[PDB]
Each structure stands twice: as structure tokens, then as C-alpha cells.
Design a protein around this ligand. Structure first.
Ligand code: NA
Ligand code: NA
Ligand code: NA
Ligand code: NA
Length: 327
DNA sequence: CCGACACCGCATCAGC
DNA sequence: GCTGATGCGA
DNA sequence: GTCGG
């Protein structure tokens, strides 16, 4: 990835715009347009010299080109400078960094004078359970997880899962499975041969055991199929304790497990390609299944999948390691 | 010109 | 009390 | 905001 000294002023600007669209204007599609513009620029291996040059990249249109022209000539953007000094908008944007506070909650809070973390601390009674946990770990949740801590975390998850029942299958996916040197959270996919698409406490038993050994510390949400919560590695005596971390655990039917693992391994870019390719060979892939497409476009019934490689074999692609699924 | 821009599990609200 | 909608995060 | 039917 080209040094961000290249176009970092431009991509930072676009990302800041993206956030205000999402969190203040509640314009999720403009949020994503700015994100896509910023991504394509961040990978452009030349220092951009004009809006017209940037406009050639897919996802950069007339308006962002105009904004790049103004940034290059003046070193700033009038609209962005203004919105940053706006006390109401900057506060709404900021509050959304608390897990559980979205654009709607943030606007309600700022409306009633609640603008800072200290204001949230004073008003516990107006926070729901999720938002209280997000406040508690506000700083911890914004730190990344070094891969060595993810390995220590994996060790615990895989040990305790097998202890509940040695027939469970658990896989830590996300960028960690692709080999990333750091993670933002831990995404665990779980299955059991007794659970198929046409097969009730399989998830709870695992959560309970991880809570019993004091790895899981808090629960954001928990149902029959998805757990979302908080975990923390055990601290060695005297040594500073580790930050609390976000962990999700999903229970997936066995016949859909490897479609799940393939999907939640990613990357997002590799996933678009593989589904693009799959289409071009007569198959439709989603996170659950791969199905054949007839000539008139009618999807037939899901194909049996017993490994990730089964999916690749169907679409006439050679198996690619997680480490090579960057695109 | 103008619709798409992913889908869904869970917590919680809004309406009956 | 139930049912569907909405907010949130993925 | 951008793309494309
Ligand atoms: Na463009
Ligand atoms: Na938030
Ligand atoms: Na956020
Ligand atoms: Na056993």
C-alpha cells in the first residue's frame, strides 16, 4: 500500500466527510460513496495532482473531484472546516464511537444536552445495556488486537469449546485467519454435527463455559444463533491487565458451515470476485449455500459442501489459502 | 432521469 | 400481551 | 455521491 504521505490529506478528508454523512446526515449511501472514493485513492500509487486525475478512478465523481481541486489549492475544504467547528455536529459524530450509540441515539443525546463521554457517565439511566458496555470499554474497543494476543485468545476458545463437546467445530475467521498481524475483534464460527438446516442450546453451552473460565466478561446480545460480547485474556500477576476485546460467536448449521467460513474469512474484495466468478460459471454463492443457476436463471437446490475446497471445486477455481484471499 | 447501493440476528420500540 | 418496525452492528 | 440501465 503506497505510503499515506502520498494522498493522505485527500483520503483523510474523504473519510471525515464519510463519517459526517453516516453519523450526522444519516446518508448511508453517501457514507459508502466517500469510503469507496477514499479506498480507490488510497491504493493509487501516484501523488494526485488534480481532481480530473482522480476522477478517472472508479468511484470518484464530479463532486469529489471538485473537492480534491479545492483541497489541493487551499490545503483544506470550507464545508469540512465548518462542520468540525459545529458543536452539535461534531458531538453527534463523536458519540457514535460508543458501541451501541448509532446516528439516531447520538442525535437524541445531543438534542438533550448530552455531548461528551462525561455526559454519558452522568446519565447511566438513559443508556441501554449495550451502550453501557460500550461506554465502559470505550477506549479498549478502539485498540487493535496484536496477532499474538489473538493466538492466545484462540487457544482459550478452542480448548474450552472442545471441553464442552469434542465434536464441536470452531474456526476463528476474519482477517486473522487470512494471516493479519492485527485484528479489530474476534469472530468465531461454531458448528456441531447434530445441527443441520432441517435438524437449541449448542451456543449457550459454549458461551457458558467461556464465562465460567472468566474469558467472556460481558454480553452485548445472545440468542440461539449469534452471541456478541466482550472478552479479556487472563493477566499474569503484577503485569498490566489486557484490554477488553470484542468477540462474536455464531452457531451455523453443519451443511452451511464452510460457506460461512469462506464468507466470514473474506476479504470483502476476494468475496466479490469469487461470487462474480461463480456467477460466470453458473453458480450463485452466498454466506449460506452455493446453488446452480439454470438457463432461465432459476436457482436450484443447494449443493453439498463439506469443506471450503468443495466450493472452489464447483466453480472450477483452484483452492486459495486464506493468506492469498486479499483479493 | 432515477433506482441501487446486502443481508440478517438480536434488543428494543411502536402500534395494536 | 402479541406482532411488526426500527436501530444497531456488523 | 457515484454509477449505470
Ligand atoms: Na470516476
Ligand atoms: Na456506535
Ligand atoms: Na461507531
Ligand atoms: Na467427546
Amino acid at each position: 500500500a503506497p505510503q499515506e504521505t502520498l494522498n493522505g490529506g485527500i483520503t483523510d478528508m474523504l473519510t471525515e466527510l464519510a463519517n459526517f454523512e453516516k453519523n450526522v446526515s444519516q446518508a448511508i449511501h453517501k457514507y459508502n460513496a466517500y469510503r469507496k472514493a477514499a479506498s480507490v485513492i488510497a491504493k493509487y500509487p501516484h501523488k494526485i495532482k488534480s481532481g480530473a486525475e482522480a476522477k478517472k478512478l472508479p468511484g470518484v465523481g464530479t463532486k469529489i473531484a471538485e473537492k480534491i481541486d479545492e483541497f489541493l489549492a487551499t490545503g483544506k475544504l470550507r464545508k469540512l472546516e465548518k462542520i468540525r467547528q459545529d458543536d452539535t455536529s461534531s458531538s453527534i459524530n463523536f458519540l457514535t464511537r460508543v458501541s451501541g450509540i448509532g446516528p439516531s441515539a447520538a442525535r437524541k443525546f445531543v438534542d438533550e444536552g448530552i455531548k461528551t463521554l462525561e455526559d454519558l457517565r452522568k446519565n447511566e439511566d438513559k443508556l441501554n445495556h449495550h451502550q453501557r458496555i460500550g461506554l465502559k470499554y470505550f477506549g479498549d474497543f478502539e485498540k487493535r488486537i496484536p496477532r499474538e494476543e489473538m493466538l492466545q485468545m484462540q487457544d482459550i476458545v478452542l480448548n474450552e469449546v472442545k471441553k464442552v463437546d469434542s465434536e464441536y467445530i470452531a474456526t476463528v475467521c476474519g482477517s486473522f485467519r487470512r494471516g493479519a498481524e492485527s485484528s479489530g475483534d474476534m469472530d468465531v464460527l461454531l458448528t456441531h454435527p447434530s445441527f443441520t438446516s432441517e435438524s437449541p442450546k449448542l451456543l449457550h453451552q459454549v458461551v457458558e463455559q467461556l464465562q465460567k473460565v472468566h474469558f467472556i466478561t460481558d454480553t452485548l446480545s445472545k440468542g440461539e444463533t449469534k452471541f456478541m460480547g466482550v472478552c479479556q485474556l487472563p493477566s499474569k500477576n503484577d503485569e498490566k491487565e489486557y484490554p477488553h476485546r470484542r468477540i462474536d460467536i455464531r452457531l451455523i448449521p453443519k451443511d452451511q458451515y464452510y460457506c460461512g467460513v469462506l464468507y466470514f474469512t473474506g476479504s470483502d474484495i476476494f468475496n466479490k470476485n469469487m461470487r462474480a466468478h461463480a456467477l460466470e460459471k453458473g453458480f450463485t454463492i452466498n454466506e449460506y449455500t452455493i446453488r446452480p443457476l439454470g438457463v432461465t436463471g432459476v436457482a436450484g437446490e443447494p449443493l453439498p459442501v463439506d469443506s471450503e475446497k468443495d466450493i472452489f471445486d464447483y466453480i472450477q477455481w483452484k483452492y486459495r489459502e486464506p493468506k492469498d484471499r486479499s483479493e
